[PDB]
Amino acid sequence: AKEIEFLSWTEPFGIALTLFAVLGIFLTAFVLGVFIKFRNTPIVKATNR
């Protein structure tokens, strides 16, 4: 039988990409949270909240 070629989820390459995307999501969430907590400091308020 012939072989099917595609970017699998369990391949050693796709796992790294998934982990990196998850890390990016986590970092964005952290930045959002730290802006939310320090809501009205002059540094945060200077940029359009």
């Binding site: 002059p42 308020k45 200077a46 359009n48 909240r49």
Partner: protein
């Protein structure tokens, strides 16, 4: 320093001080610059930036 410490609205207003004499002739540019700065900061406040 003693005369500038009598304000208690430091979070909202500001004070501009300039020593002058009967010979000093640069007062108009001080007034102009202070007014321009006051106008600029007033608009930032309305927009919420400052």
């Amino acid at each position: 320093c003693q005369f500038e410490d009598l304000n208690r609205r430091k979070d909202t207003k500001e004070i501009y001080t300039h020593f002058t004499c009967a010979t000093d002739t640069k007062n108009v540019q001080f007034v102009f610059d202070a007014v321009t700065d006051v106008i600029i900061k007033n608009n930032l406040k309305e927009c919420g930036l400052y």
